[PDB]
Design a protein around this ligand. Structure first.
Ligand SMILES: [Cl-]
Lengths: 574, 574
């Protein structure tokens, strides 16, 4: 029945998905949309979307309210994520002017004030904060690691820095003269940031098991808790902060979350919103607008508190019926920790039935009540889906997130393995598979090498294979992240690399990998194939042309997803 | 959509295909069939088939008329073609007894007398003629290269030997006492052989541009032309001899061919047969039976002279209509030689239209008026198909066949390239692709490296990549074949290896390869991928698990064929 599968996977990939970016030109929404087979940028106003870009893009920079242009970010390296920036004047959609003062680099983030384009980027030798204005390009600061611009008000630039130990610092700079100041909390990590009318930095602070709001004065580094007019926020007791931002009327919008579902607050007061997860919030036409998604709702743009959709891709009825349910469960792991695990029940599988432990990437990411095309495709193909938030995940507090540091292929793998055991013991699973992309594919390899026999077969997509060789091929941002994750230990880099444990593998493995991935490079995957072959192991492989880690077309998504589904479907017929 | 493609490809692979092997037990036909998703062995006696084997096989040994058992040949190495032999008593189908005296080896051929099993096999160090009887296993003779047992009558064993220069010798042995006698012709190559009631060896002799029948007296090596009672055979002036064999009533059956179509003769008299190609001929309940195939007929078993089908997988009408036409054309090549080229016009493509030069394997093989699943799948996918009998091909005389010796990636490539020129100049092709498996995949790599720009893109399946490295990884039979092809020259082995010319590649390439292929091993392909990556070339790859050069399940066929069709369909949308 592999042709009905191809049709489903294609349709699931093809459904339109929207992301809210801001408000530009004359009170028009700026949205990034996956539509017509690729990622594009649109203006929305009444009913007509207007396409701003020509060729597919990856993202746009964050515009200040009402600015008359959009800065596209586009990979100009066939997936290697050397990106260039292209200005589109909102009054002349489809006319792109490349910003040639900026040589290609990995663009990490940025904001457009209308007078300066401020962005962070990584090259081979550094990560930096840059400003481009009418006078040309300037390097404001070199950063100690991944950094992201959060907000600019006047000359004050605020951002978030991964500058050591897995922890997130706040940073500020000056638009006119550059420099850098770093603010490190001893309680936890800063999570989102926005500059108040008073020129203090409002930030989410994620502590051991909770999250709150703080005010940082960039002049003296003083921090204090921020109390809001309404106490709905406090009383919600979020674990994590998704996003926050000052609206143009001075009110503070915050999206915060717990147990994989978020809520929206304006000056601390709850605003009704559809169940699942939300993104940015903007004031448009004097009304509140956000993005929304859930496990059964592809990302869409909705009005609050109505919940009425402004932009939404429809899911076909027959596909909707493929997802028979979802649940959040707490799996007990090796040390007694409770692993929050999202479960998707297939309507096309019995119970007990074939079940895939689909391991998330990052590692600093989470499985949540948010749309997941891979999880949906598995349900449509007749597999239940188990999605464990292993230690290292976001969404459950700083202490759980930091447990991974210095211990890749250790406790987090136990968490994945405990989720696998739960799926069988709880009676959901008749047979067990493992699948993941990126850090998830790492986990597949680690499970098959370190836990032979636990799974029937594994799918490893865009995998980490060898920390040591990857390190040598990585840009400045990735080198630093590798050092942080591995705790700067060569012994960890080696012992936790599954290329060094190939002899232990006993289960069928499918490798899937984009040839131009600059994060998880193909080179070590070739050596892994060589090891599998020399040792007589069973394996299959699919390498995808002219694509990298970030997939921005339906054609590339099909090529990275379909083989995995075919492979698992074929395994299930054994 | 790709899902309608998956469906047609699957259906084209799934249609049942039959090969006639002999007559066993109580006048029952023995057939090998691709059916129920794999290659199996069957008895047929007027009604439903009876399955002899359990797990899929590769082939059966050639039984003497009426023997009460069948010897299955099965790969027990997950595609690496280390096979074992399994006896099935024809009265107890489905019960297999492994012949343990015979360790796994590449079984090349063999005959079962009912009292002795005589076969040729290759190990790392030898190719040998073996006999297994009540007394155990005995090595009758070591052979100078690939050899195939053709017939046994009494104590006399006759076979065909590739014992130098691409030329085929006859050999004989004695079942009781072993040994080896080799008979060479200065005029050409022996093609098929059967022992007359007079204990002479009747053989087809293929000469420079023609074929005939000869009588070899194994006692003195004397040769003379064989005159048959009816002159239809000699007046047909075949170019090649497909098969010959004495029927149990003493009559000589011959199948011979010219221009990619065969004819069947019985004591020299033509018997009417369906247009296309025929396999072995047997007498069954006193009536003649053979296999038949054509470009629009999957291999089936028919009665002669009527042509009524005994066993036939019916080609669905809608798939039949996907081939709008076929032609045999004579492409003019670089040196004036005329390359007989078979052409399928797709009913789902305009003219001019996307066209694939689909290069056959071997190299000692031909494109003929014979079913080809790959070619049918390309027509169904909306490509015209061009299949050139490049120099080295069978069917057109000894001289054309031996031109390739000492010159791989030379003249034959010119023939393939002339075919591509013809497709464009004749007005068939709007755009050109190259696709092939095995020696065909070699040709793809050779075209992309030596003729950059001629093709839009290529599919290389189970390719020859590096003659030097493959030589070092080959068994005794393959090493010898490699020396024969390359003319024993280390310079040819290197300069005609496309891994040495990777920098020249400019077109998109899709590699497809079974992991356990022992003929065209995966190992050099991994190095090729390393080279393509290091040099920044666009490529995709699909490596198939637990399979080798000889595909014997529908699931493995889908895995080797579908990626090629997807890739070309995608290329066509550029
Ligand atoms: Cl067959």
């Amino acid at each position: 029945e592999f042709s009905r599968i191809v049709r489903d996977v294609e349709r699931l990939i093809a459904v339109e998905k929207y992301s809210l970016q801001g408000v530009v030109d004359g009170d028009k929404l700026l949205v990034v949309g996956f539509s017509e087979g690729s990622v594009n940028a649109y203006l929305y106003d009444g009913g007509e979307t207007v396409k701003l870009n020509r060729e597919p893009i990856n993202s746009v920079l964050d515009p200040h309210y009402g600015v008359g242009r959009v800065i596209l970010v586009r990979d100009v390296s066939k997936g290697a994520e050397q990106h260039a920036l292209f200005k589109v004047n909102t009054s002349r959609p489809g006319e792109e002017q490349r910003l040639e003062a900026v040589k290609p680099m990995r663009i990490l983030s940025g904001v457009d004030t209308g007078e300066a384009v401020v962005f962070t980027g990584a090259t081979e030798d550094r990560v930096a904060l840059y400003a481009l204005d009418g006078g040309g390009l300037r390097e404001l600061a070199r950063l100690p690691g991944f950094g992201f611009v959060s907000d600019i008000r006047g000359d004050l630039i605020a951002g978030l820095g991964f500058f050591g130990g897995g922890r997130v610092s706040l940073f500020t700079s000056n638009l006119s003269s550059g420099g850098l100041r770093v603010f490190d909390s001893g309680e936890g990590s800063f999570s989102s940031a926005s500059i108040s009318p008073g020129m203090k930095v409002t930030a989410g602070l994620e502590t051991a098991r909770e999250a709150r709001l703080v005010t940082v004065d960039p002049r003296d580094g003083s921090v204090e808790d921020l109390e809001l007019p309404s106490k709905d926020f406090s009383s919600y007791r979020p674990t994590a902060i998704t996003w926050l931002g000052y609206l143009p009327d001075g009110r503070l919008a915050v999206v915060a979350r717990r147990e994989g579902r978020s809520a929206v607050f304006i000056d601390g007061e709850r605003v009704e919103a559809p169940q699942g997860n939300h993104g940015r919030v903007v004031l448009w036409r004097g009304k509140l607008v956000t993005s929304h998604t859930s496990l059964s709702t592809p990302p869409r743009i909705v009005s609050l508190p109505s919940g009425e959709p402004l932009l939404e891709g429809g899911l076909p009825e027959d596909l909707r019926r493929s997802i028979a349910g979802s649940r959040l469960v707490w799996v007990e792991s090796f040390d007694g920790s409770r692993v929050p695990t999202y479960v998707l029940e297939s309507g096309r599988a019995p119970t007990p039935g074939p079940t895939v432990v689909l391991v998330h990437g990052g590692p600093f990411a989470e499985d949540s009540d948010s749309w997941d095309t891979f999880a949906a495709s598995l349900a449509a193909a007749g597999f239940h889906v188990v999605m464990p938030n292993y230690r290292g995940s976001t969404g459950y507090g700083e202490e759980w997130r930091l447990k991974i540091i210095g211990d890749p292929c250790g406790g987090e793998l136990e968490d994945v393995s405990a989720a696998a055991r739960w799926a069988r013991e709880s009676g959901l699973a008749s047979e067990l598979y493992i699948m993941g992309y990126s850090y998830g594919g790492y986990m597949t390899l680690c499970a098959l090498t370190m836990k032979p026999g636990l799974f029937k077969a594994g799918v490893a997509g865009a995998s980490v294979v060898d920390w040591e060789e990857m390190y040598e091929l990585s840009d400045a941002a990735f080198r630093n992240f590798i050092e942080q994750l591995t705790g700067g230990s060569r012994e960890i880099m080696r012992s936790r690399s599954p290329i060094n444990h190939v002899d232990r593998i006993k289960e069928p493995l499918a490798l899937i990998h984009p040839q131009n991935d600059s994060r998880t490079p193909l080179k070590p995957l070739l050596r892994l194939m060589g090891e599998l072959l020399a040792r007589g192991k069973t394996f299959e492989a699919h390498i995808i042309p002219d694509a990298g880690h970030a997939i921005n077309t339906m054609e590339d998504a099909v090529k990275i997803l379909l083989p995995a589904v075919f492979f698992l479907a074929t395994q299930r017929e054994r």
